[PDB]
């Protein structure tokens, strides 16, 4: 085509294309290499990606995200019923299937999870098209290893609706291993551990690879642990700080909280490269600016338990795979959160100093591998 590889993420999506033996992780119209898996509806327009997430704080009811948590599931599914209680948007039941309901151009409308995700894939498709200067048709789209047939089918349908011919649906951990060339035959079988920590979910997958054939040995994790949870710890920290300094609680002002959450997410990323970060918010509450800062140490302490807890699923995955730490040949980092120095330290210490595969941006590794496989299938 060339064909492309797309990581349809829980919170961010990424598209890459393999040309001249190299993978190109494609930047969007705003120059970002990953795009929010968001879609918004207003009185006049449908927004997608950066444009949608950039207005989430002011239009919470009609800004959709987490469609991946609904995709391929039934309305009465326990997880679906549990998640709805936390989303600002409506999820309704249509013949037993979940649909998000929103207001668009003054009218009420509902979309299936695959329709919402097709909008995200369309955005990724156009992003690739703007870079290639050519129409993009074929693509490989990834999914978590634990996805069932219905979830895989619905993800594929999201692609078809986007005008893409889905060459294949492959597992995210497998895509990651392919990015590092771990799929090449080298004689005996090799055990690869994929440590994936994104913005909303945590997954540990152990794969055994032999003759280019992957075998998911075990999967562990927490579908409700991700970078967004680390931002929450920071948010509460600063809400307390603002109350101390100004004797005012901003907790009930949904927008002040989102602007603070956005500032924390940005500071967090900085703390992965530097030891301190400055928070500066103009007019956060009742015209009061919030200028402060936070140290990496402070950040690590606010999340110490959450970070350390990532090691339990690692132990359990090993146990279920019937392998000992020492039998793992490669450890691959996936997800933007794995860029956090403390998490790398924890994982490495657990593996007694073993080096981590982390040269490819973790939040891009899945798209990277998908792009490689998409080319191979073309
Ligand atoms: N440099 C960084 N340091 C810490 N966290 C990061 C960094 N870059 C991205 N992240 C985080 O990774 C998370 C999710 O991004 P990925 O790109 O992993 O998305 P998804 O949630 O769909 O897997 C977010 O919480 C984001 O804040
Ligand atoms: Cl864009
Ligand atoms: Cl430590
Ligand atoms: K992603
Ligand atoms: Mg991910």
From Swiss-Prot:
Record GO biological process: chaperone cofactor-dependent protein refolding; clathrin coat disassembly; mRNA processing; negative regulation of DNA-templated transcription; protein refolding; protein targeting to lysosome involved in chaperone-mediated autophagy; RNA splicing; synaptic vesicle uncoating
Description of post-translational modifications: Acetylated.
Entry's localization field: Cytoplasm; Melanosome; Nucleus, Nucleolus; Cell membrane
Stimuli inducing this protein: Constitutively synthesized.
Signal peptide start-end: none
Keyword Protease: no
Catalytic activity: ATP + H2O = ADP + phosphate + H(+)
Tissue expression summary: Ubiquitous.
Enzyme class: hydrolase
GO molecular-function terms, A-Z: ATP binding; ATP hydrolysis activity; ATP-dependent protein folding chaperone; heat shock protein binding; protein folding chaperone; protein-macromolecule adaptor activity
GO cellular component: cytoplasm; cytosol; lysosomal membrane; melanosome; nucleolus; nucleus; plasma membrane; presynapse
Modified residues (N6-acetyllysine): 105, 243, 316, 325
Cystines in this chain: none
Record text on subunit structure and interactions: Component of the chaperone-assisted selective autophagy (CASA) complex consisting of BAG3, HSPA8/HSC70, HSPB8 and STUB1/CHIP. Identified in a IGF2BP1-dependent mRNP granule complex containing untranslated mRNAs. Interacts with PACRG. Interacts with HSPH1/HSP105. Interacts with IRAK1BP1 and BAG1. Interacts with DNAJC7. Interacts with DNAJB12 (via J domain). Interacts with DNAJB14 (via J domain). Interacts (via C-terminus) with the E3 ligase STUB1 forming a 210 kDa complex of one STUB1 and two HSPA8 molecules.
Functional summary from the UniProt entry: Molecular chaperone implicated in a wide variety of cellular processes, including protection of the proteome from stress, folding and transport of newly synthesized polypeptides, chaperone-mediated autophagy, activation of proteolysis of misfolded proteins, formation and dissociation of protein complexes, and antigen presentation. Plays a pivotal role in the protein quality control system, ensuring the correct folding of proteins, the re-folding of misfolded proteins and controlling the targeting of proteins for subsequent degradation.
Protein name: Heat shock cognate 71 kDa protein
Native source organism of the sequence: Bos taurus (Bovine)
Gene encoding the protein: HSPA8
First and last residues shown, out of full length: 4 to 381 of 650
């Amino acid at each position: 085509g060339p064909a492309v590889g797309i990581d349809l993420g829980t919170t961010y999506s990424c598209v890459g294309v393999f040309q001249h033996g190299k993978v190109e992780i494609i930047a969007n119209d705003q120059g970002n290499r990953t795009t929010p898996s968001y879609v918004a509806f207003t009185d006049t327009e449908r927004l997608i990606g950066d444009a949608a997430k950039n207005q989430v704080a002011m239009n919470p009811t009609n800004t959709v995200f987490d469609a991946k948590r609904l995709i391929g599931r039934r309305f009465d599914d326990a997880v679906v019923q549990s998640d709805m209680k936390h989303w600002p948007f409506m999820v309704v039941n249509d013949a037993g299937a979940p649909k998000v309901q929103v207001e668009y151009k003054g009218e009420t409308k509902s979309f299936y999870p695959e329709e919402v995700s097709s909008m995200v894939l369309t955005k990724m498709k156009e992003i690739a098209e703007a870079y290639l200067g050519a129409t993009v048709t074929n693509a490989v789209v990834t999914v978590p290893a634990y996805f069932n047939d219905s979830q895989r089918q619905a993800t594929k349908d999201a692609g078809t609706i986007a005008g893409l011919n889905v060459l294949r649906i492959i597992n995210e951990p497998t895509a990651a291993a392919i990015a590092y060339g771990l799929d090449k035959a080298v004689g005996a079988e090799r055990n690869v551990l994929i440590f994936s920590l994104g913005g909303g979910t945590f997954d540990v997958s152990i794969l055994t690879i032999e003759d280019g054939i992957f075998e998911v040995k075990s999967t562990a994790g927490d579908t409700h642990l991700g970078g967004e949870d680390f931002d929450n710890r920071m948010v509460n920290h600063f809400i307390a700080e603002f109350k101390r300094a100004h004797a005012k609680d901003i907790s009930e002002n949904k927008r002040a909280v989102r602007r603070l959450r956005t500032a924390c997410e940005r500071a967090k990323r900085t703390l992965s490269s530097s030891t301190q970060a400055s928070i500066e918010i103009d007019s956060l509450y009742e015209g009061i600016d919030f200028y402060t800062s936070i140290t990496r140490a402070r950040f690590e302490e606010l999340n110490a338990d959450l970070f350390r807890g990532t090691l339990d699923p690692v132990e359990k995955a090993l146990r279920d795979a019937k392998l000992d730490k020492s039998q793992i040949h490669d450890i691959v980092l996936v997800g933007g959160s794995t860029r956090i120095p403390k998490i790398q330290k924890l994982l490495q210490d657990f593996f007694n100093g073993k080096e981590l595969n982390k040269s490819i941006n973790p939040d891009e590794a899945v798209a990277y591998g998908a792009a490689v496989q998409a080319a191979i299938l073309s």
